[PDB]
Each structure stands twice: as C-alpha cells, then as structure tokens.
Amino acid sequence: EALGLIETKGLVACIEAADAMCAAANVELIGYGNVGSGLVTAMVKGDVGAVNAAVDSGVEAARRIGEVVTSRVIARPHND
Amino acid sequence: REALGLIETKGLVACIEAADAMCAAANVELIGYGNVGSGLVTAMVKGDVGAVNAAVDSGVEAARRIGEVVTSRVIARPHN
Amino acid sequence: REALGLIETKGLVACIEAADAMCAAANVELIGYGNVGSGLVTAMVKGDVGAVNAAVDSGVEAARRIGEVVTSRVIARPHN
Amino acid sequence: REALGLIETKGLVACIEAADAMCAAANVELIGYGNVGSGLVTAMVKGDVGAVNAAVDSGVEAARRIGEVVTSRVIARPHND
Amino acid sequence: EALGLIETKGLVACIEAADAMCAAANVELIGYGNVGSGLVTAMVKGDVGAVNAAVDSGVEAARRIGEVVTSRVIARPHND
Amino acid sequence: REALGLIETKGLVACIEAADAMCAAANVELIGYGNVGSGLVTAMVKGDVGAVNAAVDSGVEAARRIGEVVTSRVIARPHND
C-alpha cells in the first residue's frame, strides 16, 4: 500500500494534517513519528490515488495552522 | 464523537495554565498533554463543540498572559 | 484540593535552586520536576495559597541569581 | 562483516525517502533509523560495498529533493556495530 | 549532605567536570541529569567544604573543554 | 584502571565515523555512545592511555572530514564510570 507523509513544526499542525488526510480520502492513519526539534510526521496508508488526495489537502489544512516542513507520497514503499 | 480542543505553547507552565483555564471555562475534560520537544507542549480537551470552543478561547487568553501560544485549534468531528 | 506553584527555568541547575528555595521559603511540598526539552525545566510545588505564593516569590528570586527564569505561576485552585 | 551506508537528514520525511531510495537502488538491507534529536535522523543500510555505495548515492539524490541532507557516509569495513 | 551542581553545554565537558570534581575533594558522584538542548548536569555529594572545592575545580576543568553554563553548591538541600 | 577517550560530534554520522576511526587506529574498545540531544552525540573508548590518545587523535581527524567535532578529551585515570 502507498504511504503518505506530512511533517510539521508542532504537534497541533500535525493533528490537523492527519485529520484532513483521513477526511479527504480513503486513507488509514498509521500513527505519528516524532524526532524532536518540534518535527512531527503524520503517516497514512492507502491506494496511491487516495494517498495523493489525502496528503494534498492535509498539507493545505496544516498550512492554515502552522509550518509544513515537508511532505511526500511513496507509491510503493520497500520497507515498513 | 466528541470535539477536540488543542492549545500548543512554548513551555510547560503556559500549557498547564491553558489547560486549567480550558477546564474552568466550559464543560470539557482534559485528555492529557503532548510534548514533541523544542519546548512545544500541547493541552488537549474533549467535549461538545460549543463547550470546546469556549474552553479553547479562554485557554488561549490565559496562556498568553503567561507566555507564548504558538497555535490552537478546535476539531469539531475528529476522524482518528 | 491544594494550590500549585510552578517555576520554569532554562537549564536544570537553576530549577533545582528554585525548587530548594521554594521549599525553604514556606510550607510547600515539592511535587517533582517537569521537562519538555529545549532546556526548559519546571519545578512544581503544592500547598495552601499563601505558602505557595511565598515559595514561588523567593524561588524566582533564587533562580534568577543562577540563570533564566522563563515563567512562573500560582494556581490557587487547580482543576486537574 | 558487511559494509554500512549512512544518510543523515534534517527531518523524518527526508530520511524515510532516503531509506526507501537506498533500498530501491541496490541490494542493500535497511538496518533501522537513528535519532539524536535536533531533527537529525539517520537511515542505516547494510550490504556489500558496491551495492551500499550505489544505495547511498541515490538515497542522497532522493532526499535532497525533499529536504536537507546534512551528511552521508559509506564504511566499507566497520569495526563496531 | 551538601550538593554540588555543574551544568555544561555538551556531554564531554560534563564528564570532565565530574572527573575533576571527584579528583579535587572527597565528594561522591551522584550521577548526571540531562534535560535536552545539550545541557547536562554533574551532581556531587559531600561535606560543604569538599563540595565547594570540588565544584570550583570542576568548573575550571570544564571551561578548558567547553561551555559551563551554571554551577551551584547547595549547603543544605531540602529535597532529593 | 583504564583510560577513557571521548569525541563529541554534531550529528550521528560524524560520531559513528569518529568511533570507527578510533577503533581502527589503536587497541581501544568502544564503550558505546552518549547522546544528550541538540544533535550532540559522544563516542566513548576504553584502553591504555597511549592507545586511547592515538585512537582519539585520528578519530577526530576522520570525523572533521564528515562534520562538526565540538569537543574531545582523553582522561588517563578516570575517577568514576
């Protein structure tokens, strides 16, 4: 399954990105990843069409709240 | 099926104040705190959307007296 | 059912000094420390509101000699 | 008894991409990630030195599109780990 | 027992401070305290004369290596 | 009764390089790493003071190629640890 990734500065922007990802398309929230320095990543799972649509509006919603530092869709992940 | 209120502050003391002012302002229940490092700490509350909007509103006002409020949000119908 | 005193400092050593000076100043009980990274460390005390106000007052005075007092607060009637 | 490739990025998303791009580029095996705070995250791969050199090369190219590649390295014959 | 505290930017300066404290006088290393942001604290225990001599040359030693951000001797700690 | 060698770097990859070059340079044994956040991570080695001085010396040279060496130290007769 494809993997969608949005990393934000701060936890609240990330929760919003994750909520907007799961509202926008048929993706499943995998969880969050925190590496300190305020960087938090929301991770979603689905078909590449859904994941591309989820990440797209996850990024738009998060930018209203705060800092989106990077985002990515990986259509065919090798690990995880 | 409960709304979610979120206040993120720079520092723990502003966050405790935000959480205390949220719980004093309306019929919301504190879920806990979330810390992602960099000094960013998030208070999270639960309730009906009217109560949550009133708590976050005065939670933000109280915290700003103490310190830095970096972001806030009410999510009326959270997906995850 | 007890008031709460809070001092957040830049660095661990100032915080230990604030906490020692709080507990020497009045009949307050150290609850523990809270660390949210970024060097921010919070000393937390418990007592009647008169004692807690006297503890925090001289806790802040002591810590400022050593280092940075970034925020402080007395919550006379904490909700959590 | 195997070479080690290392890519350190600013942020978690660049690192996952580097790790995905390393494992797609050559016959390397992801060992895991290492996080030391300050946003610095390191993907670590294992393989023969030819494969590991090719994985890191394109891992760095992939990550740089996404974000900050702060350092990278191939250790052909590691003494520890 | 008195408590001596040296906080440095970085782990190597702190290990150096702790080694120089314990070499200078009859103090006993309690451990380290790390609160992130690179701040690390060496803590020693002993009679107040020893702890004052330990902290003094721990501070001198650490400064050769790196950044000493604060230091303190607490002659009669109320907690810990 | 053994000396301690210490190299602290900004970032995990420089530190692994320092640690590998310490163990390649002399008869020292890697104790482990120490991370205090802010990107600062420390390689720690054990051995006779001559070996430890030789290891730390070239551990620092190797790491400086990759990244930032923020501090280093040899403690010939450590009181604790």
Coordinates of C-alpha atoms in Angstrom, one line a residue:
Chain A
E1 CA 0.0 0.0 0.0
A2 CA 1.1 3.5 -0.7
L3 CA 2.4 5.8 2.1
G4 CA 1.6 9.5 2.7
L5 CA 3.8 11.6 4.9
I6 CA 3.4 15.2 6.2
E7 CA 5.9 16.7 8.6
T8 CA 5.0 19.8 10.6
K9 CA 6.6 22.2 13.1
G10 CA 4.5 21.5 16.2
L11 CA 2.1 18.8 17.2
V12 CA -1.2 20.7 16.5
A13 CA -0.5 21.4 12.9
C14 CA 0.2 17.6 12.6
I15 CA -3.0 16.5 14.2
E16 CA -4.8 18.8 11.8
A17 CA -2.9 17.4 8.8
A18 CA -3.8 13.9 9.9
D19 CA -7.4 14.8 10.4
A20 CA -7.5 16.5 7.0
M21 CA -5.8 13.5 5.3
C22 CA -8.3 11.0 6.7
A23 CA -11.3 13.3 5.9
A24 CA -10.2 13.9 2.3
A25 CA -9.8 10.3 1.0
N26 CA -9.9 6.6 2.0
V27 CA -6.6 6.5 3.8
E28 CA -5.9 4.9 7.2
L29 CA -3.8 6.8 9.8
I30 CA -0.8 4.7 10.7
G31 CA 0.4 6.9 13.6
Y32 CA 2.8 9.7 14.2
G33 CA 6.6 10.0 14.2
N34 CA 8.4 12.5 16.4
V35 CA 12.2 13.1 16.1
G36 CA 12.3 16.1 18.4
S37 CA 13.1 19.7 17.4
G38 CA 9.3 20.2 17.1
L39 CA 9.1 18.0 14.0
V40 CA 6.2 15.6 13.9
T41 CA 5.1 13.4 11.0
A42 CA 1.6 12.1 10.2
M43 CA 1.6 8.9 8.3
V44 CA -1.3 7.4 6.2
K45 CA -1.8 4.2 4.2
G46 CA -3.9 3.6 1.2
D47 CA -4.1 3.3 -2.6
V48 CA -1.9 5.8 -4.4
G49 CA -4.9 7.8 -5.6
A50 CA -6.4 8.2 -2.2
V51 CA -3.0 8.9 -0.6
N52 CA -2.2 11.6 -3.1
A53 CA -5.6 13.2 -2.4
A54 CA -5.2 12.9 1.4
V55 CA -1.7 14.4 1.5
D56 CA -2.7 17.3 -0.8
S57 CA -5.5 18.5 1.5
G58 CA -3.6 17.5 4.6
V59 CA -0.9 20.0 3.5
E60 CA -3.4 22.7 2.7
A61 CA -5.2 22.4 6.1
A62 CA -1.9 22.3 8.1
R63 CA -0.6 25.4 6.4
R64 CA -3.6 27.3 7.8
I65 CA -2.5 26.4 11.3
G66 CA 1.3 26.4 11.2
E67 CA 4.5 25.2 9.5
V68 CA 4.5 22.3 7.0
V69 CA 8.2 21.5 6.6
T70 CA 8.0 18.6 4.1
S71 CA 5.5 16.1 2.6
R72 CA 5.7 13.0 0.4
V73 CA 3.8 10.2 -1.2
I74 CA 5.6 6.9 -1.6
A75 CA 3.6 4.9 -4.1
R76 CA 5.4 1.6 -3.4
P77 CA 7.4 1.5 -0.2
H78 CA 10.2 -1.0 0.1
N79 CA 10.4 -1.2 3.9
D80 CA 7.9 -0.6 6.8
Chain B
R1 CA -18.0 11.6 18.5
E2 CA -16.7 14.4 20.7
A3 CA -14.9 17.6 19.6
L4 CA -11.2 18.1 20.3
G5 CA -9.6 21.4 21.6
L6 CA -5.9 21.9 21.2
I7 CA -3.6 24.6 22.6
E8 CA 0.2 24.4 22.0
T9 CA 2.5 26.6 24.0
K10 CA 6.2 27.3 24.2
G11 CA 7.0 25.9 27.6
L12 CA 5.2 23.7 30.2
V13 CA 3.9 26.4 32.5
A14 CA 1.8 28.3 29.9
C15 CA 0.4 24.9 28.9
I16 CA -0.7 24.0 32.4
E17 CA -2.3 27.4 32.6
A18 CA -4.0 26.9 29.2
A19 CA -5.3 23.5 30.4
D20 CA -6.5 24.9 33.7
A21 CA -8.3 27.8 32.0
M22 CA -9.9 25.4 29.5
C23 CA -11.3 23.2 32.2
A24 CA -12.5 26.3 34.2
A25 CA -14.2 27.9 31.2
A26 CA -16.5 25.1 30.0
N27 CA -17.7 21.5 30.4
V28 CA -14.6 20.0 28.8
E29 CA -12.4 17.1 30.0
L30 CA -8.6 17.2 29.8
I31 CA -7.3 14.3 27.8
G32 CA -3.6 14.9 28.7
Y33 CA -0.6 16.7 27.3
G34 CA 1.5 16.1 24.3
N35 CA 5.2 17.1 24.1
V36 CA 7.1 16.9 20.9
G37 CA 10.3 18.6 22.2
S38 CA 11.7 22.0 21.3
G39 CA 9.7 23.3 24.3
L40 CA 6.4 22.8 22.5
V41 CA 3.7 21.3 24.7
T42 CA 0.0 20.8 23.8
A43 CA -3.0 20.7 26.0
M44 CA -5.9 18.6 24.6
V45 CA -9.5 18.8 25.7
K46 CA -12.7 16.9 24.9
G47 CA -16.3 18.0 24.9
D48 CA -19.3 19.1 22.8
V49 CA -18.2 21.6 20.2
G50 CA -19.8 24.6 22.0
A51 CA -18.0 23.8 25.2
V52 CA -14.7 23.1 23.4
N53 CA -14.9 26.4 21.5
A54 CA -15.4 28.3 24.8
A55 CA -12.6 26.5 26.6
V56 CA -10.0 26.9 23.9
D57 CA -11.0 30.6 23.6
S58 CA -10.2 31.4 27.2
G59 CA -7.5 28.8 27.4
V60 CA -5.6 30.9 24.8
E61 CA -6.3 34.2 26.6
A62 CA -5.0 32.8 29.9
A63 CA -1.8 31.3 28.4
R64 CA -0.9 34.5 26.5
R65 CA -0.6 36.3 29.9
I66 CA 2.0 33.7 30.9
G67 CA 3.9 33.1 27.7
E68 CA 3.9 32.1 24.1
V69 CA 0.9 30.5 22.4
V70 CA 2.2 29.0 19.2
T71 CA -1.1 27.5 17.7
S72 CA -4.6 26.4 18.7
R73 CA -7.4 24.5 17.0
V74 CA -10.9 23.1 17.6
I75 CA -11.7 20.0 15.6
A76 CA -15.5 19.5 15.8
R77 CA -15.6 15.9 14.4
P78 CA -12.2 14.2 14.6
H79 CA -11.5 11.2 12.4
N80 CA -8.8 9.5 14.4
Chain C
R1 CA -7.5 20.5 46.8
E2 CA -4.3 22.4 47.1
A3 CA -2.7 25.3 45.3
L4 CA 0.0 24.6 42.8
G5 CA 3.2 26.6 42.3
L6 CA 5.3 26.5 39.1
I7 CA 8.7 27.8 38.1
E8 CA 10.2 27.1 34.7
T9 CA 13.8 27.7 34.1
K10 CA 16.4 27.5 31.3
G11 CA 18.6 24.6 32.5
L12 CA 18.4 22.0 35.2
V13 CA 20.6 23.8 37.8
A14 CA 18.5 26.9 38.1
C15 CA 15.4 24.7 38.5
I16 CA 16.9 22.8 41.4
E17 CA 17.8 26.1 43.0
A18 CA 14.3 27.4 42.5
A19 CA 12.9 24.2 44.0
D20 CA 15.2 24.3 47.0
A21 CA 14.4 28.0 47.6
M22 CA 10.6 27.3 47.3
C23 CA 10.7 24.5 49.9
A24 CA 12.9 26.6 52.2
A25 CA 10.6 29.7 52.0
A26 CA 7.3 28.2 53.0
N27 CA 5.4 25.1 54.0
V28 CA 5.1 23.8 50.4
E29 CA 5.8 20.2 49.2
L30 CA 7.8 19.6 46.1
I31 CA 5.7 17.6 43.6
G32 CA 8.6 16.9 41.2
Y33 CA 10.1 18.4 38.0
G34 CA 8.7 18.6 34.5
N35 CA 11.0 18.6 31.5
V36 CA 9.7 19.4 28.0
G37 CA 13.1 19.6 26.3
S38 CA 14.7 22.8 24.9
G39 CA 16.3 23.1 28.3
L40 CA 13.0 24.2 29.8
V41 CA 12.6 22.6 33.3
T42 CA 9.7 23.2 35.7
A43 CA 9.7 22.9 39.4
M44 CA 6.2 22.2 40.9
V45 CA 5.1 22.7 44.5
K46 CA 1.9 22.1 46.4
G47 CA 0.4 23.9 49.4
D48 CA -2.0 26.5 50.7
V49 CA -2.2 29.5 48.5
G50 CA -0.4 31.8 51.0
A51 CA 2.5 29.4 51.4
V52 CA 2.7 28.7 47.6
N53 CA 2.8 32.4 46.8
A54 CA 5.7 32.9 49.2
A55 CA 7.6 29.9 47.9
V56 CA 7.3 30.9 44.2
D57 CA 8.2 34.5 45.1
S58 CA 11.6 33.6 46.6
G59 CA 12.1 30.6 44.3
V60 CA 12.1 33.1 41.4
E61 CA 14.5 35.4 43.3
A62 CA 16.9 32.5 43.9
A63 CA 16.8 31.1 40.4
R64 CA 17.4 34.5 38.7
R65 CA 20.7 34.7 40.5
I66 CA 21.8 31.5 38.8
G67 CA 20.1 31.7 35.5
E68 CA 17.0 32.3 33.4
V69 CA 13.5 32.3 34.9
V70 CA 11.3 32.0 31.9
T71 CA 7.8 31.8 33.6
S72 CA 6.2 31.2 36.9
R73 CA 2.6 30.8 38.2
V74 CA 0.5 30.1 41.2
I75 CA -2.8 28.3 40.5
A76 CA -4.8 28.7 43.7
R77 CA -7.4 26.1 42.8
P78 CA -6.2 23.8 40.1
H79 CA -8.8 21.9 38.1
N80 CA -6.6 18.9 37.5
Chain D
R1 CA 31.1 -8.4 8.2
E2 CA 29.2 -6.1 5.8
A3 CA 29.6 -2.5 4.7
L4 CA 27.4 0.2 6.2
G5 CA 25.8 3.2 4.5
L6 CA 24.6 6.2 6.4
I7 CA 22.4 9.1 5.4
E8 CA 21.5 11.8 8.0
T9 CA 18.7 14.2 7.2
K10 CA 17.0 17.2 8.8
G11 CA 13.5 15.8 9.5
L12 CA 11.9 12.4 9.5
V13 CA 10.3 12.6 6.0
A14 CA 13.6 13.2 4.1
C15 CA 15.1 10.2 6.0
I16 CA 12.2 7.8 5.1
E17 CA 12.7 8.8 1.5
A18 CA 16.4 8.3 1.6
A19 CA 15.9 4.9 3.1
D20 CA 13.3 4.0 0.5
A21 CA 15.6 5.2 -2.3
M22 CA 18.6 3.3 -0.9
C23 CA 16.8 0.0 -0.8
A24 CA 15.3 0.5 -4.3
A25 CA 18.6 1.4 -5.8
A26 CA 20.7 -1.6 -4.9
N27 CA 20.8 -4.9 -2.9
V28 CA 21.0 -3.3 0.5
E29 CA 19.1 -4.1 3.6
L30 CA 17.7 -1.4 5.9
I31 CA 19.1 -1.8 9.4
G32 CA 16.9 0.9 11.0
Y33 CA 17.0 4.6 11.8
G34 CA 18.9 6.5 14.4
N35 CA 17.6 9.7 16.0
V36 CA 19.8 12.0 18.1
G37 CA 17.3 14.9 18.4
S38 CA 17.6 18.4 16.9
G39 CA 15.6 16.9 14.0
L40 CA 18.7 14.9 12.8
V41 CA 17.6 11.4 11.7
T42 CA 19.9 8.8 10.1
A43 CA 19.0 5.9 7.9
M44 CA 21.4 3.0 8.0
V45 CA 21.7 0.2 5.4
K46 CA 23.8 -2.9 5.1
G47 CA 25.3 -4.7 2.1
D48 CA 28.4 -5.3 0.0
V49 CA 30.4 -2.1 -0.6
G50 CA 29.4 -1.8 -4.3
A51 CA 25.7 -2.0 -3.5
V52 CA 26.0 0.2 -0.4
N53 CA 27.8 2.8 -2.4
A54 CA 25.1 2.8 -5.1
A55 CA 22.3 2.9 -2.5
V56 CA 23.7 5.9 -0.6
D57 CA 24.4 7.8 -3.9
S58 CA 20.8 7.8 -4.9
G59 CA 19.5 7.9 -1.4
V60 CA 21.2 11.3 -1.1
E61 CA 19.8 12.4 -4.5
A62 CA 16.2 11.4 -3.5
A63 CA 16.4 13.1 0.0
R64 CA 17.9 16.3 -1.3
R65 CA 14.7 16.9 -3.4
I66 CA 12.6 16.6 -0.2
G67 CA 14.8 18.4 2.3
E68 CA 18.2 18.8 4.0
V69 CA 20.9 16.1 3.6
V70 CA 23.3 17.0 6.3
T71 CA 25.9 14.2 5.9
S72 CA 26.4 10.8 4.4
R73 CA 29.0 8.0 4.5
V74 CA 29.9 4.5 3.4
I75 CA 32.0 2.5 5.8
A76 CA 33.4 -0.4 3.8
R77 CA 34.6 -2.4 6.8
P78 CA 33.1 -1.3 10.1
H79 CA 35.0 -2.2 13.3
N80 CA 32.0 -2.0 15.6
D81 CA 28.2 -2.3 15.2
Chain E
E1 CA 24.9 16.4 52.8
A2 CA 25.7 19.3 50.6
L3 CA 25.1 19.1 46.8
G4 CA 27.3 20.5 44.1
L5 CA 26.0 21.1 40.6
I6 CA 27.8 21.9 37.3
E7 CA 25.8 22.2 34.1
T8 CA 27.6 22.3 30.8
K9 CA 26.7 22.5 27.1
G10 CA 27.6 19.0 25.9
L11 CA 28.4 15.7 27.4
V12 CA 32.2 15.7 27.3
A13 CA 32.7 18.9 29.3
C14 CA 30.3 17.4 31.9
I15 CA 32.2 14.2 32.2
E16 CA 35.3 16.3 32.6
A17 CA 33.7 18.4 35.2
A18 CA 32.6 15.3 37.1
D19 CA 36.0 13.7 36.9
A20 CA 37.7 17.0 38.2
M21 CA 35.2 17.4 41.0
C22 CA 35.7 13.9 42.3
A23 CA 39.5 14.3 42.0
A24 CA 39.6 17.6 43.8
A25 CA 37.9 16.7 47.1
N26 CA 36.1 13.9 49.0
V27 CA 32.9 14.1 47.1
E28 CA 30.8 11.2 45.6
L29 CA 29.3 11.4 42.1
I30 CA 25.5 11.1 42.3
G31 CA 25.0 10.9 38.5
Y32 CA 24.1 13.1 35.6
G33 CA 21.0 15.0 34.8
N34 CA 20.1 15.7 31.1
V35 CA 17.2 18.0 30.2
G36 CA 17.9 18.1 26.5
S37 CA 19.2 21.1 24.5
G38 CA 22.7 19.8 25.1
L39 CA 22.5 20.8 28.8
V40 CA 24.0 18.1 31.1
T41 CA 24.5 18.4 34.9
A42 CA 27.0 16.6 37.0
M43 CA 25.9 16.3 40.7
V44 CA 28.2 15.5 43.6
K45 CA 27.6 14.9 47.3
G46 CA 29.8 15.6 50.3
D47 CA 30.5 17.9 53.2
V48 CA 30.1 21.6 52.2
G49 CA 33.9 22.3 52.3
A50 CA 34.7 19.4 50.0
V51 CA 31.8 20.2 47.6
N52 CA 32.9 23.8 47.4
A53 CA 36.4 22.6 46.5
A54 CA 35.1 20.0 44.0
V55 CA 32.8 22.4 42.2
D56 CA 35.5 25.1 42.0
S57 CA 38.0 22.9 40.1
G58 CA 35.3 21.1 38.2
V59 CA 34.3 24.5 36.8
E60 CA 37.9 25.3 36.0
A61 CA 38.4 22.0 34.2
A62 CA 35.2 22.0 32.2
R63 CA 35.9 25.5 30.8
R64 CA 39.1 24.3 29.1
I65 CA 36.9 21.8 27.2
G66 CA 33.7 23.7 26.6
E67 CA 30.8 25.8 27.9
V68 CA 30.0 26.0 31.6
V69 CA 26.5 27.4 31.7
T70 CA 25.9 27.5 35.5
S71 CA 27.1 26.0 38.8
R72 CA 25.9 25.9 42.3
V73 CA 26.6 24.5 45.8
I74 CA 23.5 23.9 48.0
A75 CA 24.8 23.5 51.5
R76 CA 21.6 22.0 53.0
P77 CA 19.3 20.7 50.3
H78 CA 15.7 20.3 51.5
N79 CA 14.5 17.8 48.9
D80 CA 16.2 15.0 46.8
Chain F
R1 CA 42.4 1.3 35.7
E2 CA 41.8 2.1 32.0
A3 CA 41.9 5.5 30.2
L4 CA 38.7 7.0 28.6
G5 CA 38.6 8.6 25.2
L6 CA 35.8 10.9 24.3
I7 CA 34.7 12.5 21.0
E8 CA 31.5 14.6 20.7
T9 CA 30.1 15.5 17.3
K10 CA 27.2 17.4 15.9
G11 CA 25.2 14.6 14.3
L12 CA 25.1 10.8 14.5
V13 CA 27.0 10.1 11.3
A14 CA 30.2 12.0 12.2
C15 CA 30.1 10.2 15.6
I16 CA 30.0 6.7 14.0
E17 CA 32.9 7.8 11.8
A18 CA 34.8 9.0 14.8
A19 CA 34.1 5.8 16.6
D20 CA 35.1 3.6 13.7
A21 CA 38.4 5.5 13.2
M22 CA 39.1 5.3 17.0
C23 CA 38.8 1.5 16.9
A24 CA 40.8 1.3 13.7
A25 CA 43.7 3.5 15.0
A26 CA 44.6 1.6 18.2
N27 CA 43.8 -1.1 20.6
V28 CA 40.8 0.7 22.2
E29 CA 37.4 -0.8 22.8
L30 CA 34.2 1.1 22.0
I31 CA 32.1 1.6 25.2
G32 CA 29.0 2.9 23.4
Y33 CA 27.6 6.3 22.5
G34 CA 26.2 9.1 24.6
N35 CA 23.5 11.4 23.3
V36 CA 22.4 14.5 25.2
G37 CA 20.1 15.9 22.5
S38 CA 20.6 19.1 20.5
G39 CA 22.4 16.9 17.9
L40 CA 25.4 16.3 20.3
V41 CA 26.5 12.7 20.4
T42 CA 29.6 11.2 22.0
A43 CA 31.7 8.2 21.1
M44 CA 33.5 6.8 24.2
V45 CA 36.5 4.4 24.1
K46 CA 38.5 2.4 26.6
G47 CA 42.1 1.4 26.6
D48 CA 45.7 2.1 27.8
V49 CA 46.4 5.8 27.7
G50 CA 48.8 5.5 24.8
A51 CA 46.3 3.6 22.7
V52 CA 43.4 6.0 23.7
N53 CA 45.5 9.1 22.8
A54 CA 46.2 7.5 19.4
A55 CA 42.6 6.5 18.8
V56 CA 41.1 9.8 19.8
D57 CA 43.7 11.7 17.6
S58 CA 42.7 10.0 14.4
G59 CA 39.0 9.6 15.4
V60 CA 38.9 13.4 15.5
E61 CA 40.6 13.8 12.1
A62 CA 38.2 11.4 10.4
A63 CA 35.1 13.0 11.9
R64 CA 36.2 16.5 11.0
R65 CA 36.0 15.4 7.3
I66 CA 32.4 14.4 7.7
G67 CA 31.1 17.1 10.1
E68 CA 31.5 19.0 13.3
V69 CA 33.7 17.9 16.1
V70 CA 32.6 20.0 19.0
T71 CA 34.9 18.6 21.8
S72 CA 37.3 15.8 22.6
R73 CA 39.1 14.5 25.6
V74 CA 41.3 11.8 27.0
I75 CA 41.0 11.1 30.7
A76 CA 44.1 8.9 31.6
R77 CA 42.8 7.8 35.1
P78 CA 39.0 8.3 35.4
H79 CA 37.6 8.5 38.9
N80 CA 34.1 7.4 38.1
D81 CA 32.4 5.1 35.4

